[PDB]
Design a binder for this molecule. Sequence first.
Ligand SMILES: NC(=O)c1ccc[n+]([C@@H]2O[C@H](COP(=O)([O-])OP(=O)(O)OC[C@H]3O[C@@H](n4cnc5c(N)ncnc54)[C@H](O)[C@@H]3O)[C@@H](O)[C@H]2O)c1
Ligand SMILES: NC(=O)c1ccc[n+]([C@@H]2O[C@H](COP(=O)([O-])OP(=O)(O)OC[C@H]3O[C@@H](n4cnc5c(N)ncnc54)[C@H](O)[C@@H]3O)[C@@H](O)[C@H]2O)c1
Lengths: 483, 483, 483, 483
Amino acid sequence: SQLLNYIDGNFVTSASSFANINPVNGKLISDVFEADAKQVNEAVVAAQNALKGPWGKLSVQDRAALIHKIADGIQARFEEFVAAEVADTGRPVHQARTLDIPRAIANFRTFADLAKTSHTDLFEMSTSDGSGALNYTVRKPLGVIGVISPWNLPLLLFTWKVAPALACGNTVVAKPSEESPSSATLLAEVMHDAGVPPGVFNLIHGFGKDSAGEFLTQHPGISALTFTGESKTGSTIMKAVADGVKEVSFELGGKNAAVVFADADLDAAIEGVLRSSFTNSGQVCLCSERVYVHRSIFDEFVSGLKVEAERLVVGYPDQDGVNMGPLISHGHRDKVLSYYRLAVDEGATVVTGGGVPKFNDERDQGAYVQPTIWTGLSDKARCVTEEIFGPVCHISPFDDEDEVINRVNDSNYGLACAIWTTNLSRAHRVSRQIHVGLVWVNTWYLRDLRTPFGGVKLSGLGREGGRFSMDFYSDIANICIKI
Amino acid sequence: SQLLNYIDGNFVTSASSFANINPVNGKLISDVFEADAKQVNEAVVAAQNALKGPWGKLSVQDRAALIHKIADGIQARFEEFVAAEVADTGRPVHQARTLDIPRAIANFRTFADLAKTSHTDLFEMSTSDGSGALNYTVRKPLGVIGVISPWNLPLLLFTWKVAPALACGNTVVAKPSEESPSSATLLAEVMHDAGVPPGVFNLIHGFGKDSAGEFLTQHPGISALTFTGESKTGSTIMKAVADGVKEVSFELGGKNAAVVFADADLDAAIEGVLRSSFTNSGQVCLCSERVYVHRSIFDEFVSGLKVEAERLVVGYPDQDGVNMGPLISHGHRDKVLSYYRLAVDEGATVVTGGGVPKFNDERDQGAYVQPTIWTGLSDKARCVTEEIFGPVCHISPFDDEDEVINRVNDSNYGLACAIWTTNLSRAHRVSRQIHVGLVWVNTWYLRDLRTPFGGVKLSGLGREGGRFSMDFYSDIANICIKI
Amino acid sequence: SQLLNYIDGNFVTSASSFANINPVNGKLISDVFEADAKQVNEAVVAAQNALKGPWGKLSVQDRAALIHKIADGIQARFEEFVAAEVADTGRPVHQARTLDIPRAIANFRTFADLAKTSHTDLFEMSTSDGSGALNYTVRKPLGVIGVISPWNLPLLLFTWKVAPALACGNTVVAKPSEESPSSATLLAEVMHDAGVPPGVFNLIHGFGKDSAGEFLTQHPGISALTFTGESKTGSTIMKAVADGVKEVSFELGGKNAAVVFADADLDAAIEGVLRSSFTNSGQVCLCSERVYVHRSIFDEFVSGLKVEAERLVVGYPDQDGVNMGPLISHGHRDKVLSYYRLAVDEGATVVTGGGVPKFNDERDQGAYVQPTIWTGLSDKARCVTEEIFGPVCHISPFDDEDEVINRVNDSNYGLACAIWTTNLSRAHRVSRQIHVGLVWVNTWYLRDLRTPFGGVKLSGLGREGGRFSMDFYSDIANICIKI
Amino acid sequence: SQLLNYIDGNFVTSASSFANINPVNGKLISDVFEADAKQVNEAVVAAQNALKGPWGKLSVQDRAALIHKIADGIQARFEEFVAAEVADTGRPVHQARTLDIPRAIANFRTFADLAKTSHTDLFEMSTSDGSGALNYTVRKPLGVIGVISPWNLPLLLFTWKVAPALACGNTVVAKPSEESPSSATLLAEVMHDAGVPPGVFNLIHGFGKDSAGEFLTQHPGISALTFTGESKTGSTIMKAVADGVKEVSFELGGKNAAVVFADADLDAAIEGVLRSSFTNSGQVCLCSERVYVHRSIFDEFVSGLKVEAERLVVGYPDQDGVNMGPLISHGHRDKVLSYYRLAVDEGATVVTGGGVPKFNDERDQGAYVQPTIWTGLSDKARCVTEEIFGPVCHISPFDDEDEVINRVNDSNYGLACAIWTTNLSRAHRVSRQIHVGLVWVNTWYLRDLRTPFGGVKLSGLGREGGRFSMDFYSDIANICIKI
Ligand SMILES: NC(=O)c1ccc[n+]([C@@H]2O[C@H](COP(=O)([O-])OP(=O)(O)OC[C@H]3O[C@@H](n4cnc5c(N)ncnc54)[C@H](O)[C@@H]3O)[C@@H](O)[C@H]2O)c1
Ligand SMILES: NC(=O)c1ccc[n+]([C@@H]2O[C@H](COP(=O)([O-])OP(=O)(O)OC[C@H]3O[C@@H](n4cnc5c(N)ncnc54)[C@H](O)[C@@H]3O)[C@@H](O)[C@H]2O)c1
């Protein structure tokens, strides 16, 4: 099986290729052609030209209809997209089917609808001569949007950027993660088959440094770079586009906390922290890797979580009651197991997990690890401060509300937090004091595409979602008429 | 020893001082204490800590009242601020009195008012269990705002950042231009006398590279850097904050066009382009340095503009009919004159100006140049494409509408444009096609503080004004309650 | 044919029926069962109950999809809807096909979209005790919406109300005009086939006074009455709902002017006023019945419009180049011809028309009149001040801009106005001074569903369109949480 | 003393006068001159004319500044305003001082501020010919606003209407309650001394039916009638303006509930219901006259409330620890005592109060009654369903959440409700189900002037507050430019 770039309406190979590997069993899924600098230039230029072609002449309404057509096309190939996400990543099929693929479809439909409903502003003003002036704003396409995305929820995060970009009338050059190229390549097929004009959507495959990703970031022809990934990568990209002063929007790492207050529904909080720590095998940017539980219920919480964690089924994506697939790759697993050893070196108690399961079948050639809970580290331990991106959490007791707020906030990251409490005042009083972009109370990972989304501190720069997307992916121009 | 830093509620000197020179006559006005890195650190830490003191406990209504007090305090010392602005810059007293200081005061009043009226959003959503969830947003202080400002409209541009920063509950570390330190120092005393708590507003003086500006830019304690100045400096700052992923907001250079169609009110357009070319001796970022005039009215337009330009009075800030003061510095004057010569070398006709006036008095020791009009350069001439930031414009003829639109947009800058036409269709049709942040029709430099304001391409990153400032200077946090 | 009511998911007949006559030839199209007070009661109660059923449990997203399905269901039977509107009203087929049915579909699709994208407000406040409070707002269904609609654009105006009502989660009892019952009845079939729950949409046929219209209006079970029709009728309805303080939204009569300035594109203005005067045989509330033309071009304009009006083809709905059908009914034609005579009596010069065309075939039994232009009446003439609602206009000269603005505003009505001028300032200066809900410049009847729509003075009460509909058809509720 | 009307910038008397009685001691405070129909016409015509005068030429910033000048004028005579409100209404001095006058001043400042920051909308649209069109909206003054207001919080409720009316550039004819004419008359002096142009604000004294209130409501010269008062009065006014189709905004009666759940903070709930029942001697429209308390805490609740109610000091407005003044007048006291008896006759147990206190001084000639608590009535009792508007409440046990929601909602009124609970889910789940305009959770009568305010069913029509006021008190006009 082979995955080509899609540039100016044509699927094309490249001089070099790389392997896409199935993390479940370590087997080759496909060969992926790595776009070189010459090909990235071709994509950007094609995207610049497409802005002046038929795409650029579409009414907002016709543009929106075509985008609903893109979504219809994904839906018409639903299970192919499910199979592509699962193969690349080891994601349980049930989660790809009910969450990932429908959300990627919803991304297109929501931003197409926002495109149709969105409007801008009128400001009247007085002038010296008494005749007045009017200032009105308009939204125009920003230009060519460079999209660079990660491997953890590949189609969802890719379309989260591509949908608003296109809804705002931009053209796109998009570089998915080398670990998860397939569903982006299928999306290119859907675009083609839907009649999306050539150059409007371009797909380039490859890596970051000295590859497609870096070349995209360096190209003078883009107007913006939108990015989801590691904070360090964000910094590198920000430096790269600096001379061009390109617009930038970054969703970066986190080390998210969950707080369980004494008045929590304890069984629910146990279930919720279980989901927030081990969903996608801890490979969601929104996962909790630090947990704070009031001292009065600490021991009961930890015992309860251990029992639930140990009932998790780790195995095949379509295995009967499977809860966790593997990590994305052998390389990522090396990093996570290296953090497993560090926790022990730092003096953790391993409440459960802390190694890899033994399957005695092909899964032993994949990249699985066990769900893991630690106890007994200090707030300054590396395993409590650094993002691990695996199925892990450290649990720590606390006594006082102001205390735990400060401890949650004591971080260079600030993406998300989940809080468990049945008390009205506490929910609102505490939530507003947490230094993050997103707080959930008594739940986790609930998303409404209308809301602003982003992080603070090292977890990002800017916000997207709803009108924040419509603003980021557009030129906002002011036109002032003297009457 | 005259102009001090203001750090954590105290005026402090520094280890070294630099001269502030009057561009009217080259005389020493004052010595300015240059903040060193240790003092910049002290300012950022004090601002960090002030977020945790009484300032951070004010209601939005009390904060807004205090900000109106700052405004009142400027008003109460109105003529001192005029004198300080005039001394530093050579600005005509009439202009500083009727435009600069009033507009500085309006920045504070407008952002104080917007702080009281602003609200956020409520999103209801359905959930699988049928009980729903509520998502709501809140604006919170972003943190410590680093402000780095330019010399051209010193107090106006300084307060354009400081007012929204404070209105959103932030604390501030602000570095005005080394060329124009006085009004900002007076503002520090106004803050002090109004009882702004210590650490909320801090003033550090100095240069850019290897001085207070660079140091502010590198400090991990700030949450954002908002900047107005040269594009190259914007790039440098973007790189400097990259490792911290700090929020950035840049208002950068331009090479703005004016366009005059055959159906313009010719006298009004001549008057308008005279203002847009030579106001503040061509030292406003929004000035026109490129002008395109329809061939049918070209000669008449140039002839009329020459007449009006030669009637401009260039002299003392309190001289009876003064229109233009000097340039900001000898150093800037040398650069503008280097362009004056480049224009001739590039083949220009000098319609008027092209040199420095001879005053036969102390003004000859200052930094004056003549209002200058060029004709005969090609679109690729350096003098037609690089920002000069002096009292100059090149005038070129055009024939077709799509032609002049292309020539206007054929630039790495895109700050503003002015269009002169009496035709309703043309006004709206052409304006929407100009790739800039701001288009004026039949006027220039009308500003309503509610409007989004910014540039595209090298002219900027992001937008400020109205809700765009309220959003930039705030954390926008989403709180999601499961019901 | 027979047209039944639709009450609680069942098509039902009534004790009595009335004739629906084809205005083309006077022939019987169908019998229509007239709802009595008892059936109106059944519809209202069923509507109240359906609010507590499955309809009320739908998510906004599922409600919007069901509303898109209604729209699909109309599309699926598009030509039946065309044939129904044409039969009832004599509308040229081309207009019904390109304008009326597609707009009725768009009403559902647009308000379904708005429902998905709409949100509400979050207000934070300080309190004495320093802990604060949160006020958030929600949009809830108002309840049962009573809809009473007119005969001139039957399906379009009927769905303009029913779409937002349903999109906001309300249930509906709707009473279309007795002259034009067919497309509304077809719409009930679409609702049924699409699986809209019983009681959500109820259709009651009948008249106004002493019939279904009045009975709806008196029923204490409705929460709102939204209405489009004559100002007099509006006044009657307002009195009727007064004891119950029902929410009301009225779009009422007009006596709309067109103004043609000396710098107009004259040929385009002639064509414009032709359309605004004689579209739908002058039976649109937005038509121009008063026209003011600058003295310098008055004679040429009148002569030009005469020529164009005499070129209009008045004939069968599917006749080759047909432009005008008949009036709605013999009774309406009696009223219009009564004004034709009054005009002559008031001293008008009949420039063209002023009677009935003679066909010498079955159309002579229909309700046709001639397009008519008058000249020579004073501003106080009844024919210049009272709404005729036929294909007529009076044309008068003017000299001065303030004079003509005053003459346009000298009316108890204030729905719309169209202005013709090529001049940028004049367009904006004059438009803002016209005391109406809607001004068009160099066009007429361009409608964007997101805009506010409504009239002033006798022409209405309230606004609909965009968020104004979302607000009118919802309870806006404030919830204040003390923290 | 004498209270004059204020018409076209002159204080004027009338042919007839009526007495203003102090309810504390039944002494005459002043004679009030009753506007006749001719004086009302004179006021309306002056307001119409003033729209075309200097008022109408003010920039929004100058208008706002003059409105702040009105507020300043009130502040400068603060204690005079306090004395006026106290004299008229018997309201405790501390309450008029810390709440009523300050809030009246804030009404002006807040709507002045909103006027400066408010803006409107721009909609771009595609057209057949590919050139497009622009629709923009503007806010214009609606015209002459008729204001009719109640006696319970005279200045607060008066200025709640007058402030947005004027902030939106309208002119005003205002008729305060005959029971409380003083603070409004003082306000006219402030308007006069602040230099508000003649005709902009006109004050007419008199009664309702066959007096100034009725004449206002019948005058064809107004553009809107905004009203706060009884529901039957609202219905009367709605009929009165119907023929002119005037815009209407009604804030009408309530029979508001408070609900105390088992998990409430009991002492806080007891204090909260004490305030919500007996504030202003129960003469606020927002007061709780019905209380539902969970069965498990009902007895403890009633006993607590009895104690706290009996601690209330009923007496002189300036008496040391005074909590309650008298009722507004002897007539109102007759109605309230009539209810007190009816409560007995209907089966009520009197837990406390139920008659009039005995002073043995001039207060016995006043209009005092005792704070009263009933128990043992059915949900259908008149005393439980009809608004009494005195310091009274009935308390009833409940068991189930859905039960008490249904009992709260089983009312022809729907103004406000307060809920007491410490549980997060319950607070939000129950609040959204209460069919009123305003729900408070764990507090009462907290008011943020940006929020929408209004009632459902008999409690009102329309919303006011924040942009809801900016919309109601303005013409929203759409201007569509074909390009
Ligand atoms: N709205 C706008 O877009 C706008 C408005 C006004 C001026 N400008 C631009 O500003 C420029 C003129 O002002 P200027 O000469 O003062 O610009 P500048 O870039 O040379 O300096 C501006 C500020 O940045 C500081 N600075 C310089 N180097 C720095 C560094 N390495 N690190 C941190 N800070 C540094 C300076 O000390 C000064 O305070 C023009 O390009 C003009 O177009 C833009
Ligand atoms: N936010 C609210 O909804 C709110 C607020 C405060 C008071 N209220 C209500 O106000 C009522 C008590 O106030 P009130 O006793 O002064 O009401 P009142 O209705 O009887 O009338 C108040 C005003 O209306 C005038 N008026 C009376 N009859 C009129 C008529 N026929 N035509 C024109 N004007 C007429 C009166 O002169 C007076 O100025 C209560 O029902 C209370 O619920 C409601």
